[PDB]
Amino acid sequence: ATCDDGRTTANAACCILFPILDDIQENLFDGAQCGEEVHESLRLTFHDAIGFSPTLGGGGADGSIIAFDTIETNFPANAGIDEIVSAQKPFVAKHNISAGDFIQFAGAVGVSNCPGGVRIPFFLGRPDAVAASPDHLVPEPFDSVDSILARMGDAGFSPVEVVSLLASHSIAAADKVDPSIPGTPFDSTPGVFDSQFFIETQLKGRLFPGTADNKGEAQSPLQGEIRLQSDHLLARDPQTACEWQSMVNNQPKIQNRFAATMSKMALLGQDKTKLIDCSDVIPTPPALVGAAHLPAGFSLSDVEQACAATPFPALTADP
Numbered sequence: 001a002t003c004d005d006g007r008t009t010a011n012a013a014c015c016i017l018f019p020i021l022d023d024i025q026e027n028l029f030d031g032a033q034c035g036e037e038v039h040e041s042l043r044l045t046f047h048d049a050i051g052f053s054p055t056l057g058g059g060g061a062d063g064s065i066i067a068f069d070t071i072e073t074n075f076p077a078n079a080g081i082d083e084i085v086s087a088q089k090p091f092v093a094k095h096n097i098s099a100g101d102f103i104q105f106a107g108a109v110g111v112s113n114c115p116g117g118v119r120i121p122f123f124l125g126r127p128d129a130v131a132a133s134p135d136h137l138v139p140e141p142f143d144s145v146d147s148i149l150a151r152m153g154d155a156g157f158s159p160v161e162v163v164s165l166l167a168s169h170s171i172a173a174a175d176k177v178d179p180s181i182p183g184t185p186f187d188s189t190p191g192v193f194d195s196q197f198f199i200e201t202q203l204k205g206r207l208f209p210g211t212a213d214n215k216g217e218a219q220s221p222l223q224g225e226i227r228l229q230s231d232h233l234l235a236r237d238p239q240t241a242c243e244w245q246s247m248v249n250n251q252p253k254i255q256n257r258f259a260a261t262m263s264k265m266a267l268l269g270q271d272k273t274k275l276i277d278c279s280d281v282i283p284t285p286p287a288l289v290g291a292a293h294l295p296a297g298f299s300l301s302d303v304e305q306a307c308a309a310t311p312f313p314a315l316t317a318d319p
Ligand code: HEM
Pocket: 036, 039, 040, 042, 043, 045, 046, 079, 080, 139, 140, 141, 142, 148, 162, 165, 166, 168, 169, 171, 172, 173, 174, 175, 176, 177, 178, 228, 230
């Protein structure tokens, strides 16, 4: 199909997305950058979608975190979410798509700005949300591996899918874990969708980048980086460590698995067969910049190897 401005897409219903794309690229993502608002919008996809429990309720990827913001943004695990919700709300009001669609669309557009990134499959047509998520559905950084895996499993994700989804932490920072150092990233390349997160979380912790007694924080290997206790544990726990290590210097796997599992997450509470595939509207991401490496001055002995079956791969270090 050909839209009114000459751009093309497989399904004509998708043409409505092109003006939305242009608006968000400039006015949400600061001219199609992989920066703060991409990171926040990607986090929002998860905090919206994971509000889904057969037992407990919630409609998944339904826009509830915007529609029912007054309730959801006050949940403890949603600390800091209010900022991106407030930023996105006027776009939802201006354009003519549901909040659920907008959240997933913005997340997919944003990820596509990141070198090494992917096009997350995107489907159009989610109805407006009809209920708020229950509280206690979003994992927290002080939760155990058993708890995180049980919660994610309740929503439909296996442990290997959880590891896949955590490639998001390659383009990510924390504002509330240690509020003395807001904006501190989880890897050394928060503008690049790469395996650095899976490398750097495996290093022996050395220091706290800010203060030393924050709940849910582990020692980091680097002054410029923060480590979550959940990521510390997931990198090392026998249930997840082998999958974690398998991401290291495996860009094709990170790409393939993140796109597939993000699509699954974007469709929680939804039925793809009732939606329209608009995947081809998402921009083509740039190729990876940089390659897998240890930080300058580090060596393999600084890696806490946690996969009995397979030794940690030999990586070069920054000069
Ligand atoms: C599975 C367990 C998870 C835990 C415990 C967890 C925890 C956290 C925490 C504590 C933060 C920092 C919030 C702040 O203090 O500002 C964060 C940020 C973020 N999370 Fe995760 N997360 C998990 C899964 C995910 C998943 C599945 C996604 C996928 C979309 C995701 C995407 C992000 C992103 C992109 C950010 C960065 C936000 C920013 O830069 O402001 N997280 N997460």
